[PDB]
Amino acid sequence: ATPDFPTHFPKSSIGIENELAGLVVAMPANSAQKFGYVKSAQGDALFMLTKDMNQGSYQRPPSLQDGKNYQNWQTHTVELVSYPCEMDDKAAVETRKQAMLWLATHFTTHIDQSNHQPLAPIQSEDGRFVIEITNAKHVIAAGNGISAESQGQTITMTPSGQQATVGVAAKGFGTSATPELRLLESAPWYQKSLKSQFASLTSAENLDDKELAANVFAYLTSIYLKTAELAKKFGIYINEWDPMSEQITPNANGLTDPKVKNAWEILPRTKPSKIVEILSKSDAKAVMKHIKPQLQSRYSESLSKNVFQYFQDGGEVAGHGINNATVGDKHSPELAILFEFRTVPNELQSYLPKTE
Ligand SMILES: Nc1ncnc2c1ncn2[C@@H]1O[C@H](COP(=O)(O)OP(=O)(O)OP(=O)(O)O)[C@@H](O)[C@H]1O
Ligand SMILES: [Mn+2]
């Protein structure tokens, strides 16, 4: 079994996604995404071997008929998904990059002499890396996996197949305290002006933590307003809001549509309603009560009510979120909120492996 991602980190964390070029993985239909992982010889889990983009049904090349059942098997692109590490852990970042580059070299040999065969659980020549196979019911094939023989491809990785996910303590969003926080706050959807706006709206209120409440308000409002902007732009059906009722033609399949996720640039990966937990019951009520008018002053009553309710009931920004991540003291853990960089920016390029 592929180990689950560690959930706790002392400070800011980072994870990477690396979609490979030059090969496919074929597996039975409705197989689990994870088919293996790469760890250090010391035992530290570095990245998962996963199926990503469905490339159509698998057809075993006739010249490689082996008496085995490949019925209903699907081909997919391979994506290497790192186990998160600390952002300032140079060794862990580098080991992940080096392990991903080594596996690409291993994959290059694999498609040359073992095309249309599963990957074997092996140790690297230098002893540094170990492949563990969690699902042997797979095959690795060159290119798009139609031909029995390869075109002599070198397995590569490119910025277009790359993503990064940054996890920070939820209490820090809006403080600009660290370079990671400042990078996350640069998100085009984040409106820092909402912090001082909340302070102006709550002068007569005796809040338990005024600065924290303002930070949570600015974060949540920014997400709610962006969700409403996207629902209007892309014609998305949110809760009970119908875009067609406002003469908007849908041009996206929902919140999880790649182009909707790309429109965020820095995509929130955690359930918005989780942040309410970092505040007192009183402060959370004060924050929540002030959000509705921010939506209603910019958007229709129906869109406003539907966006507000969706996130209030635990609605996700773009599908299943990473909602069990924590930061700080292991014994008294604090909520971590995660963000996916749809394109890896210059500030995070050093966390990504490069073929060239
Ligand atoms: N606690 C954490 N802190 C930081 N990063 C994390 C944490 N937990 C997971 N991640 C990272 O978040 C990313 C999540 O990858 P995941 O495969 O789960 O999403 P996905 O389904 O692949 O998204 P996509 O549909 O775009 O491929 C990984 O890069 C992982 O390393
Ligand atoms: Mn991703």
mmCIF file of C-alpha atoms and ligand atoms in Angstrom:
data_model
loop_
_atom_site.group_PDB
_atom_site.id
_atom_site.type_symbol
_atom_site.label_atom_id
_atom_site.label_comp_id
_atom_site.label_asym_id
_atom_site.label_seq_id
_atom_site.Cartn_x
_atom_site.Cartn_y
_atom_site.Cartn_z
ATOM 1 C CA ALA A 1 0.000 0.000 0.000
ATOM 2 C CA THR A 2 1.271 3.535 -0.907
ATOM 3 C CA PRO A 3 1.727 5.520 2.345
ATOM 4 C CA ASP A 4 -0.637 8.475 2.810
ATOM 5 C CA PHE A 5 0.904 11.973 2.744
ATOM 6 C CA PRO A 6 2.241 13.137 6.168
ATOM 7 C CA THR A 7 -0.248 15.768 7.473
ATOM 8 C CA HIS A 8 1.891 17.771 9.972
ATOM 9 C CA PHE A 9 4.881 20.104 9.376
ATOM 10 C CA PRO A 10 6.537 22.519 11.898
ATOM 11 C CA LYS A 11 6.326 25.439 9.426
ATOM 12 C CA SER A 12 5.357 26.051 5.739
ATOM 13 C CA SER A 13 5.268 22.952 3.502
ATOM 14 C CA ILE A 14 5.658 22.167 -0.218
ATOM 15 C CA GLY A 15 4.555 19.379 -2.549
ATOM 16 C CA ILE A 16 5.109 18.974 -6.294
ATOM 17 C CA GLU A 17 3.316 17.298 -9.256
ATOM 18 C CA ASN A 18 5.298 16.212 -12.320
ATOM 19 C CA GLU A 19 3.518 14.830 -15.407
ATOM 20 C CA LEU A 20 5.927 12.746 -17.508
ATOM 21 C CA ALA A 21 6.323 12.883 -21.302
ATOM 22 C CA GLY A 22 7.249 9.976 -23.570
ATOM 23 C CA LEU A 23 5.178 7.188 -21.990
ATOM 24 C CA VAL A 24 1.838 5.951 -20.629
ATOM 25 C CA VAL A 25 0.675 3.602 -17.846
ATOM 26 C CA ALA A 26 -2.098 1.116 -18.724
ATOM 27 C CA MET A 27 -4.172 -0.341 -15.889
ATOM 28 C CA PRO A 28 -7.589 -2.065 -15.432
ATOM 29 C CA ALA A 29 -10.585 0.348 -15.619
ATOM 30 C CA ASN A 30 -11.491 2.056 -12.306
ATOM 31 C CA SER A 31 -8.061 1.183 -10.755
ATOM 32 C CA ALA A 32 -6.758 3.272 -7.827
ATOM 33 C CA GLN A 33 -4.653 6.311 -8.947
ATOM 34 C CA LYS A 34 -1.521 5.115 -7.050
ATOM 35 C CA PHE A 35 0.380 2.105 -8.482
ATOM 36 C CA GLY A 36 3.642 2.597 -6.557
ATOM 37 C CA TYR A 37 6.135 4.957 -4.878
ATOM 38 C CA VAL A 38 9.848 5.842 -4.715
ATOM 39 C CA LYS A 39 11.562 6.083 -1.316
ATOM 40 C CA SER A 40 15.160 6.729 -0.201
ATOM 41 C CA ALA A 41 17.205 3.624 0.824
ATOM 42 C CA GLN A 42 16.878 4.994 4.424
ATOM 43 C CA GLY A 43 13.075 4.516 4.122
ATOM 44 C CA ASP A 44 11.813 8.105 3.533
ATOM 45 C CA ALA A 45 8.864 8.225 1.021
ATOM 46 C CA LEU A 46 9.740 10.743 -1.772
ATOM 47 C CA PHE A 47 6.954 10.575 -4.420
ATOM 48 C CA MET A 48 3.997 8.496 -5.619
ATOM 49 C CA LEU A 49 3.716 6.851 -9.074
ATOM 50 C CA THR A 50 0.213 7.789 -10.281
ATOM 51 C CA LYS A 51 -2.049 7.639 -13.328
ATOM 52 C CA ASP A 52 -3.137 11.132 -14.460
ATOM 53 C CA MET A 53 -4.793 12.049 -17.812
ATOM 54 C CA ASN A 54 -6.902 9.291 -19.483
ATOM 55 C CA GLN A 55 -5.461 8.719 -23.012
ATOM 56 C CA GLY A 56 -8.113 6.199 -24.123
ATOM 57 C CA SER A 57 -8.603 2.413 -23.847
ATOM 58 C CA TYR A 58 -5.535 0.117 -23.851
ATOM 59 C CA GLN A 59 -5.021 -2.312 -26.724
ATOM 60 C CA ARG A 60 -2.287 -4.898 -26.141
ATOM 61 C CA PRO A 61 -0.125 -4.842 -29.329
ATOM 62 C CA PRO A 62 -0.742 -8.169 -31.209
ATOM 63 C CA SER A 63 3.028 -8.836 -31.388
ATOM 64 C CA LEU A 64 3.093 -8.774 -27.503
ATOM 65 C CA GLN A 65 0.090 -11.134 -26.898
ATOM 66 C CA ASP A 66 1.008 -12.952 -23.665
ATOM 67 C CA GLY A 67 -2.131 -14.936 -22.780
ATOM 68 C CA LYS A 68 -3.008 -12.297 -20.158
ATOM 69 C CA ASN A 69 -6.321 -10.493 -19.732
ATOM 70 C CA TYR A 70 -6.082 -6.749 -20.583
ATOM 71 C CA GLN A 71 -9.888 -6.424 -20.989
ATOM 72 C CA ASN A 72 -11.266 -2.912 -20.334
ATOM 73 C CA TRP A 73 -7.736 -1.596 -19.458
ATOM 74 C CA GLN A 74 -7.267 2.181 -19.869
ATOM 75 C CA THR A 75 -4.078 4.111 -20.797
ATOM 76 C CA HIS A 76 -3.084 7.211 -18.766
ATOM 77 C CA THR A 77 -0.243 9.692 -18.555
ATOM 78 C CA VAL A 78 2.069 9.169 -15.553
ATOM 79 C CA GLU A 79 2.300 11.852 -12.905
ATOM 80 C CA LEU A 80 4.944 11.847 -10.178
ATOM 81 C CA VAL A 81 3.390 13.278 -6.967
ATOM 82 C CA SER A 82 5.854 14.190 -4.206
ATOM 83 C CA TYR A 83 5.284 13.529 -0.525
ATOM 84 C CA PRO A 84 5.229 17.060 1.045
ATOM 85 C CA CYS A 85 8.312 18.350 2.882
ATOM 86 C CA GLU A 86 9.296 21.541 4.741
ATOM 87 C CA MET A 87 9.831 24.515 2.383
ATOM 88 C CA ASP A 88 13.250 25.309 3.934
ATOM 89 C CA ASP A 89 14.405 21.645 3.971
ATOM 90 C CA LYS A 90 17.034 21.849 1.181
ATOM 91 C CA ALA A 91 17.993 18.112 1.476
ATOM 92 C CA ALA A 92 14.367 16.856 1.192
ATOM 93 C CA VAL A 93 13.634 19.174 -1.789
ATOM 94 C CA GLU A 94 16.802 18.071 -3.651
ATOM 95 C CA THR A 95 16.330 14.310 -2.898
ATOM 96 C CA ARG A 96 12.813 14.523 -4.444
ATOM 97 C CA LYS A 97 14.167 16.276 -7.601
ATOM 98 C CA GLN A 98 17.102 13.795 -7.909
ATOM 99 C CA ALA A 99 14.785 10.757 -7.324
ATOM 100 C CA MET A 100 12.363 12.040 -10.030
ATOM 101 C CA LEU A 101 15.241 12.527 -12.524
ATOM 102 C CA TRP A 102 16.666 9.052 -11.729
ATOM 103 C CA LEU A 103 13.202 7.446 -12.297
ATOM 104 C CA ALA A 104 12.963 9.193 -15.699
ATOM 105 C CA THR A 105 16.348 7.555 -16.604
ATOM 106 C CA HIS A 106 15.026 4.191 -15.294
ATOM 107 C CA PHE A 107 11.780 4.673 -17.348
ATOM 108 C CA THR A 108 13.937 5.411 -20.469
ATOM 109 C CA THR A 109 15.635 1.970 -20.071
ATOM 110 C CA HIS A 110 12.271 0.304 -19.174
ATOM 111 C CA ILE A 111 10.542 1.314 -22.446
ATOM 112 C CA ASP A 112 13.651 0.216 -24.428
ATOM 113 C CA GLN A 113 13.943 -3.385 -23.089
ATOM 114 C CA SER A 114 10.676 -3.976 -21.135
ATOM 115 C CA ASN A 115 8.051 -2.132 -23.225
ATOM 116 C CA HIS A 116 4.426 -2.971 -22.233
ATOM 117 C CA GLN A 117 5.589 -4.543 -18.936
ATOM 118 C CA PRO A 118 4.905 -3.466 -15.318
ATOM 119 C CA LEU A 119 7.667 -1.617 -13.427
ATOM 120 C CA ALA A 120 9.564 -3.949 -11.056
ATOM 121 C CA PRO A 121 10.298 -3.021 -7.381
ATOM 122 C CA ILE A 122 14.046 -2.307 -7.658
ATOM 123 C CA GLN A 123 16.843 -0.370 -5.954
ATOM 124 C CA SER A 124 18.802 2.222 -8.025
ATOM 125 C CA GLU A 125 22.398 1.316 -9.129
ATOM 126 C CA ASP A 126 23.897 3.860 -6.676
ATOM 127 C CA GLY A 127 21.608 2.487 -3.906
ATOM 128 C CA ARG A 128 20.012 5.930 -3.271
ATOM 129 C CA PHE A 129 16.448 5.104 -4.431
ATOM 130 C CA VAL A 130 13.980 2.186 -4.052
ATOM 131 C CA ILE A 131 10.834 1.593 -6.200
ATOM 132 C CA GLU A 132 7.916 -0.012 -4.322
ATOM 133 C CA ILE A 133 5.025 -1.384 -6.432
ATOM 134 C CA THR A 134 1.603 -1.243 -4.754
ATOM 135 C CA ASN A 135 -0.386 -2.331 -7.837
ATOM 136 C CA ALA A 136 1.408 -4.916 -10.068
ATOM 137 C CA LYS A 137 -1.656 -4.911 -12.372
ATOM 138 C CA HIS A 138 -0.182 -2.203 -14.690
ATOM 139 C CA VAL A 139 2.086 -1.883 -17.768
ATOM 140 C CA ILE A 140 4.488 0.914 -18.823
ATOM 141 C CA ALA A 141 4.523 1.629 -22.568
ATOM 142 C CA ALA A 142 6.467 4.150 -24.724
ATOM 143 C CA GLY A 143 4.696 7.101 -26.343
ATOM 144 C CA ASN A 144 0.936 6.613 -26.375
ATOM 145 C CA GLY A 145 1.238 2.820 -25.880
ATOM 146 C CA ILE A 146 -0.224 1.797 -29.249
ATOM 147 C CA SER A 147 2.973 0.430 -30.864
ATOM 148 C CA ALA A 148 4.846 -2.624 -29.476
ATOM 149 C CA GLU A 149 8.180 -0.783 -29.962
ATOM 150 C CA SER A 150 9.299 2.687 -28.808
ATOM 151 C CA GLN A 151 10.657 5.594 -30.884
ATOM 152 C CA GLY A 152 13.764 5.534 -28.607
ATOM 153 C CA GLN A 153 12.261 8.242 -26.324
ATOM 154 C CA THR A 154 14.097 9.816 -23.382
ATOM 155 C CA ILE A 155 11.604 10.227 -20.502
ATOM 156 C CA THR A 156 11.408 13.926 -19.639
ATOM 157 C CA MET A 157 9.640 16.530 -17.458
ATOM 158 C CA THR A 158 8.701 20.101 -18.536
ATOM 159 C CA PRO A 159 7.255 23.237 -16.731
ATOM 160 C CA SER A 160 3.892 22.696 -18.557
ATOM 161 C CA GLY A 161 3.487 19.282 -16.849
ATOM 162 C CA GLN A 162 4.502 20.778 -13.458
ATOM 163 C CA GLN A 163 2.628 22.114 -10.415
ATOM 164 C CA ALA A 164 3.527 23.014 -6.825
ATOM 165 C CA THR A 165 1.323 23.063 -3.676
ATOM 166 C CA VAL A 166 2.240 25.273 -0.705
ATOM 167 C CA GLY A 167 0.814 24.751 2.793
ATOM 168 C CA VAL A 168 0.876 27.569 5.369
ATOM 169 C CA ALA A 169 -0.612 28.099 8.872
ATOM 170 C CA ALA A 170 -4.133 29.553 8.258
ATOM 171 C CA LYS A 171 -3.514 32.302 10.901
ATOM 172 C CA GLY A 172 -0.663 33.645 8.726
ATOM 173 C CA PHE A 173 -2.731 34.396 5.590
ATOM 174 C CA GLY A 174 -2.803 38.210 5.461
ATOM 175 C CA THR A 175 0.183 38.800 7.833
ATOM 176 C CA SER A 176 2.844 39.002 4.985
ATOM 177 C CA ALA A 177 5.296 37.610 7.661
ATOM 178 C CA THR A 178 7.261 35.179 5.401
ATOM 179 C CA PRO A 179 8.209 35.121 1.653
ATOM 180 C CA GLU A 180 5.739 32.172 1.113
ATOM 181 C CA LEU A 181 2.863 34.158 2.678
ATOM 182 C CA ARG A 182 3.746 37.266 0.594
ATOM 183 C CA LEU A 183 3.785 35.029 -2.562
ATOM 184 C CA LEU A 184 0.329 33.578 -1.663
ATOM 185 C CA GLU A 185 -1.072 37.040 -0.871
ATOM 186 C CA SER A 186 0.001 38.172 -4.419
ATOM 187 C CA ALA A 187 -2.831 35.936 -5.796
ATOM 188 C CA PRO A 188 -4.989 38.138 -8.116
ATOM 189 C CA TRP A 189 -8.180 37.044 -6.325
ATOM 190 C CA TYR A 190 -6.834 38.025 -2.841
ATOM 191 C CA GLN A 191 -7.979 41.517 -1.830
ATOM 192 C CA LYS A 192 -5.770 42.738 1.077
ATOM 193 C CA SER A 193 -7.879 45.993 1.259
ATOM 194 C CA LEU A 194 -10.664 43.849 2.852
ATOM 195 C CA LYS A 195 -8.558 43.533 6.100
ATOM 196 C CA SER A 196 -8.725 47.334 6.883
ATOM 197 C CA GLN A 197 -12.339 47.355 5.579
ATOM 198 C CA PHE A 198 -13.370 44.768 8.267
ATOM 199 C CA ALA A 199 -11.613 46.851 10.980
ATOM 200 C CA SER A 200 -13.772 49.884 9.898
ATOM 201 C CA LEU A 201 -17.006 47.765 10.014
ATOM 202 C CA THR A 202 -16.331 46.305 13.510
ATOM 203 C CA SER A 203 -15.179 49.300 15.695
ATOM 204 C CA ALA A 204 -18.049 48.952 18.273
ATOM 205 C CA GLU A 205 -17.574 45.157 18.518
ATOM 206 C CA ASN A 206 -15.458 43.654 21.320
ATOM 207 C CA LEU A 207 -13.653 40.950 19.295
ATOM 208 C CA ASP A 208 -11.441 38.267 20.934
ATOM 209 C CA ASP A 209 -8.789 38.648 18.156
ATOM 210 C CA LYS A 210 -9.419 41.688 15.864
ATOM 211 C CA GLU A 211 -6.318 41.140 13.646
ATOM 212 C CA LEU A 212 -7.093 37.409 13.174
ATOM 213 C CA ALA A 213 -10.809 38.085 12.453
ATOM 214 C CA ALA A 214 -9.840 40.744 9.822
ATOM 215 C CA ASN A 215 -7.388 38.229 8.202
ATOM 216 C CA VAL A 216 -10.067 35.424 8.081
ATOM 217 C CA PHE A 217 -12.659 37.921 6.726
ATOM 218 C CA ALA A 218 -10.332 39.142 3.919
ATOM 219 C CA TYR A 219 -9.392 35.495 3.011
ATOM 220 C CA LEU A 220 -12.993 34.117 2.984
ATOM 221 C CA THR A 221 -14.537 37.206 1.294
ATOM 222 C CA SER A 222 -11.826 37.112 -1.445
ATOM 223 C CA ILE A 223 -12.691 33.380 -2.132
ATOM 224 C CA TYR A 224 -16.492 33.996 -2.058
ATOM 225 C CA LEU A 225 -16.203 37.022 -4.394
ATOM 226 C CA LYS A 226 -13.861 35.162 -6.818
ATOM 227 C CA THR A 227 -16.249 32.135 -6.835
ATOM 228 C CA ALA A 228 -19.127 34.490 -7.781
ATOM 229 C CA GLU A 229 -16.896 36.190 -10.467
ATOM 230 C CA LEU A 230 -16.025 32.759 -11.987
ATOM 231 C CA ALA A 231 -19.648 31.461 -11.745
ATOM 232 C CA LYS A 232 -20.720 34.518 -13.777
ATOM 233 C CA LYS A 233 -17.705 34.385 -16.229
ATOM 234 C CA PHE A 234 -17.905 30.607 -16.888
ATOM 235 C CA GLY A 235 -21.664 30.068 -16.339
ATOM 236 C CA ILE A 236 -21.217 27.619 -13.436
ATOM 237 C CA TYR A 237 -24.129 25.974 -11.563
ATOM 238 C CA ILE A 238 -23.331 26.724 -7.872
ATOM 239 C CA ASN A 239 -25.726 25.171 -5.329
ATOM 240 C CA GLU A 240 -29.170 26.368 -6.612
ATOM 241 C CA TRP A 241 -27.944 29.361 -8.733
ATOM 242 C CA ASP A 242 -28.714 28.897 -12.441
ATOM 243 C CA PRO A 243 -26.420 30.917 -14.794
ATOM 244 C CA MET A 244 -29.127 30.698 -17.522
ATOM 245 C CA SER A 245 -31.485 32.691 -15.214
ATOM 246 C CA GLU A 246 -29.065 35.701 -15.666
ATOM 247 C CA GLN A 247 -28.641 35.127 -19.478
ATOM 248 C CA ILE A 248 -25.235 33.419 -19.019
ATOM 249 C CA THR A 249 -24.351 30.494 -21.255
ATOM 250 C CA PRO A 250 -22.228 27.809 -19.474
ATOM 251 C CA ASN A 251 -18.677 27.549 -20.940
ATOM 252 C CA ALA A 252 -17.200 25.246 -18.232
ATOM 253 C CA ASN A 253 -18.184 21.840 -16.730
ATOM 254 C CA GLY A 254 -18.160 23.191 -13.144
ATOM 255 C CA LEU A 255 -15.768 24.434 -10.435
ATOM 256 C CA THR A 256 -13.363 21.486 -11.206
ATOM 257 C CA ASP A 257 -13.014 22.356 -14.934
ATOM 258 C CA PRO A 258 -9.254 22.804 -15.715
ATOM 259 C CA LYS A 259 -9.876 26.315 -17.158
ATOM 260 C CA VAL A 260 -11.829 27.365 -14.005
ATOM 261 C CA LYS A 261 -8.931 26.076 -11.773
ATOM 262 C CA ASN A 262 -6.421 27.875 -14.116
ATOM 263 C CA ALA A 263 -8.436 31.132 -13.692
ATOM 264 C CA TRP A 264 -7.578 31.149 -9.923
ATOM 265 C CA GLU A 265 -3.801 30.873 -10.777
ATOM 266 C CA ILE A 266 -3.106 30.181 -7.071
ATOM 267 C CA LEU A 267 -5.858 27.627 -6.402
ATOM 268 C CA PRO A 268 -7.172 27.177 -2.787
ATOM 269 C CA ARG A 269 -6.934 23.422 -2.013
ATOM 270 C CA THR A 270 -8.523 23.501 1.490
ATOM 271 C CA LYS A 271 -12.264 23.669 2.338
ATOM 272 C CA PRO A 272 -12.975 27.377 3.148
ATOM 273 C CA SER A 273 -15.249 26.555 6.174
ATOM 274 C CA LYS A 274 -12.218 24.988 8.013
ATOM 275 C CA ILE A 275 -10.683 28.500 8.686
ATOM 276 C CA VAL A 276 -13.632 29.421 10.995
ATOM 277 C CA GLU A 277 -12.060 26.955 13.528
ATOM 278 C CA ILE A 278 -9.002 29.244 14.104
ATOM 279 C CA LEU A 279 -11.369 31.902 15.619
ATOM 280 C CA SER A 280 -13.584 31.930 18.748
ATOM 281 C CA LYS A 281 -17.316 31.073 18.207
ATOM 282 C CA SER A 282 -18.070 34.847 18.723
ATOM 283 C CA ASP A 283 -15.354 36.128 16.285
ATOM 284 C CA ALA A 284 -16.389 33.541 13.629
ATOM 285 C CA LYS A 285 -20.055 34.740 13.852
ATOM 286 C CA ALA A 286 -18.873 38.383 13.449
ATOM 287 C CA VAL A 287 -16.769 37.445 10.369
ATOM 288 C CA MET A 288 -19.570 35.337 8.761
ATOM 289 C CA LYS A 289 -22.270 38.025 9.297
ATOM 290 C CA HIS A 290 -20.177 40.644 7.430
ATOM 291 C CA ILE A 291 -19.462 38.449 4.327
ATOM 292 C CA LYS A 292 -23.050 38.394 2.833
ATOM 293 C CA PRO A 293 -23.179 42.238 2.150
ATOM 294 C CA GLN A 294 -19.808 42.107 0.338
ATOM 295 C CA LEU A 295 -21.352 39.632 -2.147
ATOM 296 C CA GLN A 296 -24.734 41.465 -2.284
ATOM 297 C CA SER A 297 -23.138 44.856 -3.099
ATOM 298 C CA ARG A 298 -21.450 43.296 -6.227
ATOM 299 C CA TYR A 299 -23.623 40.297 -7.234
ATOM 300 C CA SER A 300 -27.328 39.365 -7.605
ATOM 301 C CA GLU A 301 -29.220 38.213 -4.482
ATOM 302 C CA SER A 302 -29.489 34.623 -5.868
ATOM 303 C CA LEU A 303 -25.750 34.301 -6.764
ATOM 304 C CA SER A 304 -24.777 35.929 -3.398
ATOM 305 C CA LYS A 305 -27.089 33.669 -1.306
ATOM 306 C CA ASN A 306 -26.002 30.543 -3.257
ATOM 307 C CA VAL A 307 -22.223 31.266 -3.021
ATOM 308 C CA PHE A 308 -22.558 32.145 0.715
ATOM 309 C CA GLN A 309 -24.591 28.989 1.544
ATOM 310 C CA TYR A 310 -22.340 26.669 -0.590
ATOM 311 C CA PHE A 311 -19.187 27.591 1.404
ATOM 312 C CA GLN A 312 -21.087 27.797 4.732
ATOM 313 C CA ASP A 313 -22.210 24.118 4.334
ATOM 314 C CA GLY A 314 -18.578 23.046 3.667
ATOM 315 C CA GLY A 315 -18.468 23.461 -0.118
ATOM 316 C CA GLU A 316 -15.097 23.028 -1.853
ATOM 317 C CA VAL A 317 -13.397 25.565 -4.188
ATOM 318 C CA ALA A 318 -12.480 22.814 -6.790
ATOM 319 C CA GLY A 319 -13.319 19.263 -5.667
ATOM 320 C CA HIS A 320 -11.946 17.187 -2.719
ATOM 321 C CA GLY A 321 -9.668 19.382 -0.632
ATOM 322 C CA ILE A 322 -6.611 18.706 1.556
ATOM 323 C CA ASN A 323 -8.454 19.415 4.848
ATOM 324 C CA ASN A 324 -6.402 17.384 7.422
ATOM 325 C CA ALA A 325 -3.066 19.288 6.994
ATOM 326 C CA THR A 326 -1.582 20.926 10.126
ATOM 327 C CA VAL A 327 1.319 23.298 11.060
ATOM 328 C CA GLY A 328 3.228 24.219 14.260
ATOM 329 C CA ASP A 329 3.468 22.195 17.472
ATOM 330 C CA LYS A 330 2.868 18.439 16.911
ATOM 331 C CA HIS A 331 1.002 18.269 20.284
ATOM 332 C CA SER A 332 -1.199 21.371 19.708
ATOM 333 C CA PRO A 333 -1.579 21.404 15.863
ATOM 334 C CA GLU A 334 -2.839 24.459 14.004
ATOM 335 C CA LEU A 335 -4.861 24.436 10.767
ATOM 336 C CA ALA A 336 -2.829 24.519 7.547
ATOM 337 C CA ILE A 337 -4.379 25.861 4.324
ATOM 338 C CA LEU A 338 -3.037 24.715 0.954
ATOM 339 C CA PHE A 339 -2.638 26.346 -2.443
ATOM 340 C CA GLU A 340 -1.882 24.921 -5.863
ATOM 341 C CA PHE A 341 0.243 26.958 -8.263
ATOM 342 C CA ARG A 342 -1.389 26.082 -11.619
ATOM 343 C CA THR A 343 1.843 27.319 -13.296
ATOM 344 C CA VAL A 344 5.006 27.154 -11.195
ATOM 345 C CA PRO A 345 6.208 30.787 -10.691
ATOM 346 C CA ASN A 346 9.939 31.816 -10.825
ATOM 347 C CA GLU A 347 10.072 31.890 -6.965
ATOM 348 C CA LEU A 348 9.212 28.137 -6.858
ATOM 349 C CA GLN A 349 11.156 26.856 -9.917
ATOM 350 C CA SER A 350 14.055 25.591 -7.670
ATOM 351 C CA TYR A 351 11.632 23.036 -6.077
ATOM 352 C CA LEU A 352 11.028 21.389 -9.481
ATOM 353 C CA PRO A 353 13.260 18.830 -11.260
ATOM 354 C CA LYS A 354 14.576 19.770 -14.735
ATOM 355 C CA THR A 355 15.563 17.286 -17.501
ATOM 356 C CA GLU A 356 17.704 20.017 -19.122
HETATM 357 N N1 LIG B 1 0.468 19.051 3.981
HETATM 358 C C1 LIG B 1 0.828 19.409 2.741
HETATM 359 N N2 LIG B 1 1.545 20.545 2.578
HETATM 360 C C2 LIG B 1 1.938 20.888 1.349
HETATM 361 N N3 LIG B 1 1.728 20.248 0.197
HETATM 362 C C3 LIG B 1 1.001 19.139 0.386
HETATM 363 C C4 LIG B 1 0.516 18.659 1.586
HETATM 364 N N4 LIG B 1 -0.220 17.499 1.395
HETATM 365 C C5 LIG B 1 -0.162 17.309 0.101
HETATM 366 N N5 LIG B 1 0.563 18.254 -0.572
HETATM 367 C C6 LIG B 1 0.850 18.302 -2.000
HETATM 368 O O1 LIG B 1 -0.326 18.654 -2.686
HETATM 369 C C7 LIG B 1 -0.341 18.039 -3.991
HETATM 370 C C8 LIG B 1 -1.629 17.276 -4.116
HETATM 371 O O2 LIG B 1 -1.561 16.348 -5.206
HETATM 372 P P1 LIG B 1 -2.862 15.487 -5.563
HETATM 373 O O3 LIG B 1 -2.443 14.327 -6.472
HETATM 374 O O4 LIG B 1 -3.437 14.954 -4.298
HETATM 375 O O5 LIG B 1 -3.825 16.378 -6.302
HETATM 376 P P2 LIG B 1 -4.293 16.105 -7.809
HETATM 377 O O6 LIG B 1 -5.507 15.261 -7.778
HETATM 378 O O7 LIG B 1 -3.165 15.370 -8.472
HETATM 379 O O8 LIG B 1 -4.561 17.381 -8.550
HETATM 380 P P3 LIG B 1 -4.671 17.329 -10.152
HETATM 381 O O9 LIG B 1 -6.062 16.921 -10.526
HETATM 382 O O10 LIG B 1 -4.400 18.704 -10.671
HETATM 383 O O11 LIG B 1 -3.682 16.343 -10.691
HETATM 384 C C9 LIG B 1 0.929 17.198 -4.078
HETATM 385 O O12 LIG B 1 1.916 17.881 -4.833
HETATM 386 C C10 LIG B 1 1.311 16.995 -2.613
HETATM 387 O O13 LIG B 1 2.703 16.794 -2.423
HETATM 388 MN MN MN B 2 -2.478 19.479 -9.385
#
